[PDB]
Design a protein around this ligand. Structure first.
Ligand SMILES: C[C@H]1O[C@H](O[C@H]2[C@H](O)[C@@H](O)[C@@H](O[C@H]3[C@H](O)[C@@H](O)[C@H](O)O[C@@H]3CO)O[C@@H]2CO)[C@H](O)[C@@H](O)[C@@H]1N[C@H]1O[C@H](CO)[C@@H](O[C@H]2O[C@H](CO)[C@@H](O[C@H]3O[C@H](CO)[C@@H](O)[C@H](O)[C@H]3O)[C@H](O)[C@H]2O)[C@H](O)[C@H]1O
Ligand SMILES: OC[C@H]1O[C@H](O[C@H]2[C@H](O)[C@@H](O)[C@@H](O)O[C@@H]2CO)[C@H](O)[C@@H](O)[C@@H]1O
Ligand SMILES: OC[C@H]1O[C@H](O[C@H]2[C@H](O)[C@@H](O)[C@@H](O)O[C@@H]2CO)[C@H](O)[C@@H](O)[C@@H]1O
Ligand SMILES: [Ca+2]
Ligand SMILES: [Ca+2]
Ligand SMILES: [Ca+2]
Length: 686
């Protein structure tokens, strides 16, 4: 379906309470009375925006070029205050994952918005928050709701009556946010003075409950999810949850793994997550550099090009990275740099670069505001004539119609501290983009080379951002002047004469799942699709999109190939799992003494456990880990493995110097759980 890939889309991120109040009758419901501020002066109270308000503004969003709305969390949040004028208006403090937040509407309202968005050719992804319930104080159960969790109105439990249930972790507050055990098993804290009750995704009831809630959003039409705080709950559950969701529909998943930029201690773990979990990630690596190049001017175009190259080398599916200049957890771009030309440049960069851009609501209306909560002001106007509105609409159309933006390579063609001219190319489709961040200097551009075919090209933006026309002859662009602060875009597109795969999505699944191949040159007459040479049953076939069912074949990463008119396409990988997954805590007791830098990994006889690999790089299906060791000399971590299967595995130490020390003896043998979760505990064999 069109849900699988968002490569041709523009994502628009909406903080529901702050966008549009389409129904004033749900502003202050009796269920959660007293959390509404009609004056819009108490920044952490509900201001009244809702799901019906988003639906009423569909015409505006369509005209802007939005093709996927990312809705902030829609499920029932805390019904009380959490300290002075502080509420769950933002949606991240969930008390009931089965019900829509009453300030925003009900399930009918959600269904109506999603149905009307789809009628307007717009998809809806929902922000889903599995890490925690709501604010609590460990020493006082009367604060807020004490972390209470309900199942469609039926009480389940809170932080205080959990002794015999184990729905929450009880390990104290996070202190070191970079320590991986603390970040995942300790409580998320808020500087106001409270913690968020940390759900135990290793508890079978909670794992199935969260799975059911996510599946319910997809049953109601959602085209995918933005999964909150994926660095804060085990990554086995991310992969197992993604499995369940892809069995339901070929939706799109992206996870928020905040920060951990290149060169940092936890960076490789984030890259491995993006490459193996089945969940793509928000592009924080590029975000940092975008803000320093166009915002603070502390980095240059060389740094921006370097980060495009670095992310291009590390992320297997870099075209699934979701890019952004700002968001609801950082100051708005215009508060970093009030120059609107620099904002237009940053927007053009993400609109034409690899991956899919997410534009924070109101950027195009020139909203400004410092960090949370001042970056969550009310959408001020719906003016369709702003320069930014026009720019986004125009470039969104280019991204929908030119395959180079969706799937292309990226090649630097001209660079200095202020100017970046880069080229996207997908077979015969080419887009050359020039960006000059300096708003006071023009640059003479000579020696520019290109893959564009011969001819004269007008700026695709029609000079909106100071662009100019160019003349191309035999790969050379005639010398021209790039105006101060300008953005100029030159493009070429044509029909394909052979099958060209731009995307296969989702990137993981089991036999029988629907998978979508997006590209060009497939023809109108049905041809064939193979996975590792195995013919797949075709669900639908068009010139640019093929839907297939994953064949009942052996598990592992395999290559998808389209054959049309006897000619075969380029190959695109897809990870076939060994069956429906379960998320299992693997513990190895009494391992050998280790030194700083030494880490233990798990490996075994199925692709989920790396097929006996000892490789620990960003590759797909290699050794699993590393394990953590809060209970040293015992080590543990949580992994997604096929449910109800007998597996063989061993652990190994990867010393700081790269040396490998295997457990001795015979392989450990175990049968995995049939439910959502379970535990496999063994003793290290010396
Ligand atoms: C908000 C965000 O917090 C975490 O992110 C931290 C990250 O893990 C750290 O590494 C570090 O980031 C570095 C980064 O690595 C560097 O590359 C970069 O250069 O510098 C960064 C800044 O030093 O610090 C960030 C925090 O700045 C976490 O990992 C993220 O998942 C998280 N975002 C998402 O999670 C939540 C929770 O569901 C949402 O927040 C909601 O709940 C919060 C707590 O009640 C409310 O915010 C309060 O608490 C925050 C955390 O202590 C405070 O930062 C914030 O000022 C305060 O208002 C928040 O209003 C509410 O929305 C996020 O919206 C969601 O996107
Ligand atoms: O001519 C090919 C050459 O073009 C670009 O080099 C630019 C350079 O980026 C500018 O800073 C300035 O010095 O002009 C040069 C062109 O004369 C590419 O960046 C470079 O890779 C390529 O070889
Ligand atoms: O390479 C496949 C092989 O991997 C594992 O064998 C380990 C063995 O466990 C270690 O003790 C040491 O000898 O290195 C071997 C890898 O070269 C599995 O145990 C084995 O079943 C599997 O075939
Ligand atoms: Ca309302
Ligand atoms: Ca509520
Ligand atoms: Ca957690």
């Amino acid at each position: 379906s069109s849900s699988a890939s968002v490569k041709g889309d523009v994502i628009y991120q909406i903080i529901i309470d702050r966008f549009y109040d389409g129904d004033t009758t749900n502003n202050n419901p009796a269920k959660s009375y007293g959390l509404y501020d009609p004056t819009k002066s108490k920044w952490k109270m509900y201001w009244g925006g809702d799901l019906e308000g988003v639906r009423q503004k569909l015409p505006y969003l369509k005209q802007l070029g939005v093709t996927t709305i990312w809705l902030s969390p829609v499920l029932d949040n805390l019904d009380t205050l959490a300290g002075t004028d502080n509420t769950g208006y933002h949606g991240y403090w969930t008390r009931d994952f089965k019900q829509i937040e009453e300030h925003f509407g009900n399930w009918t309202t959600f269904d109506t918005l999603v149905n009307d968005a789809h009628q307007n050719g717009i998809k809806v992804i929902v922000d889903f928050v599995p890490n925690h319930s709501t604010p609590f104080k460990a020493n006082d159960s009367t604060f807020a709701e004490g972390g209470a969790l309900y199942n469609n109105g039926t009480y389940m439990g809170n932080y205080f009556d959990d002794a015999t249930k184990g729905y929450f972790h009880h390990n104290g507050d996070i202190s070191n946010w970079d320590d991986r055990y603390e970040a995942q098993w300790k409580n998320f804290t808020d500087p106001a003075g409270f913690s968020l009750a940390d759900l135990s995704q290793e508890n079978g009831t909670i794992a199935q409950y969260l799975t059911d809630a996510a599946v319910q959003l997809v049953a109601h039409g959602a085209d995918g999810l933005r999964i909150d705080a994926v660095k804060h709950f085990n990554s086995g559950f991310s992969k197992s949850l993604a499995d369940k969701l892809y069995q339901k529909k070929d939706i799109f998943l992206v996870g928020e793994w905040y920060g951990d930029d290149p060169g940092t201690a936890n960076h490789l773990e984030k890259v491995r997550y993006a490459n193996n979990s089945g969940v793509n990630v928000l592009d924080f690596d590029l975000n940092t550099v975008i803000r320093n190049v166009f915002g603070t001017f502390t980095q240059t175009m060389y740094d921006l090009n370097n980060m495009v190259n670095q992310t291009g080398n590390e992320y297997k599916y870099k075209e699934n990275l979701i890019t952004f200049i700002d968001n609801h957890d950082m100051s708005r771009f215009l508060s970093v740099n009030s120059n609107k030309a620099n904002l237009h440049q940053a927007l053009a960069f993400i609109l034409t670069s690899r991956g899919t851009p997410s534009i924070y609501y109101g950027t195009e209306q020139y909203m400004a505001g410092g960090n949370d909560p001042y970056n969550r002001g009310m959408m001020p106007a719906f003016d369709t004539t702003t320069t930014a509105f026009k720019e986004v609409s125009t470039l969104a159309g280019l991204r929908r119609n030119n395959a180079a933006i969706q799937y292309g390579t990226t090649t630097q063609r001209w660079i200095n501290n202020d100017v970046y001219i880069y080229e996207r190319k997908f077979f015969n489709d080419v887009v050359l983009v020039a960006i000059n961040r300096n708003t006071q200097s023009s640059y003479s551009i000579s020696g520019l080379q290109t893959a564009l075919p011969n001819g004269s090209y007008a700026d695709y933006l029609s000079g909106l951002l100071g662009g100019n026309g160019i003349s191309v002859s035999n790969g050379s662009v005639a010398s021209f002047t790039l105006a101060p602060g300008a953005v100029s875009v030159w493009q070429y597109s044509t029909s394909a004469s052979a099958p060209q795969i731009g995307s296969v999505a989702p990137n993981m699944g089991i036999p029988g799942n629907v998978v979508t191949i997006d590209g060009k040159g497939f023809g109108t007459t049905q041809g064939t699709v193979t996975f590792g040479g195995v013919t797949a049953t075709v669900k639908s076939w068009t010139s640019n999109r093929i839907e297939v069912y994953v064949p009942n074949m052996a598990a592992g990463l395999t290559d998808v190939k389209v054959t049309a008119g006897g000619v075969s396409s380029n190959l695109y990988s897809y990870n076939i799992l060994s069956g429906t997954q379960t998320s299992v805590v693997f513990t190895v007791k009494s391992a050998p003494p280790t030194n700083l830098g030494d880490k233990i990994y798990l490996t075994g006889n199925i692709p989920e456990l790396g097929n006996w690999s000892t490789d620990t790089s960003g590759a797909v299906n290699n050794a699993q880990g590393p394990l953590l060791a809060p209970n040293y000399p015992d080590w543990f971590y949580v992994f997604s493995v096929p449910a109800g299967k007998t597996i063989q595995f061993k652990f190994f130490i990867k010393r700081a110097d790269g040396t490998i020390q295997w457990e001795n003896g015979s392989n450990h043998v175990a049968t995995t759980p049939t439910g959502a979760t379970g535990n496999i505990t063994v003793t290290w064999q010396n």
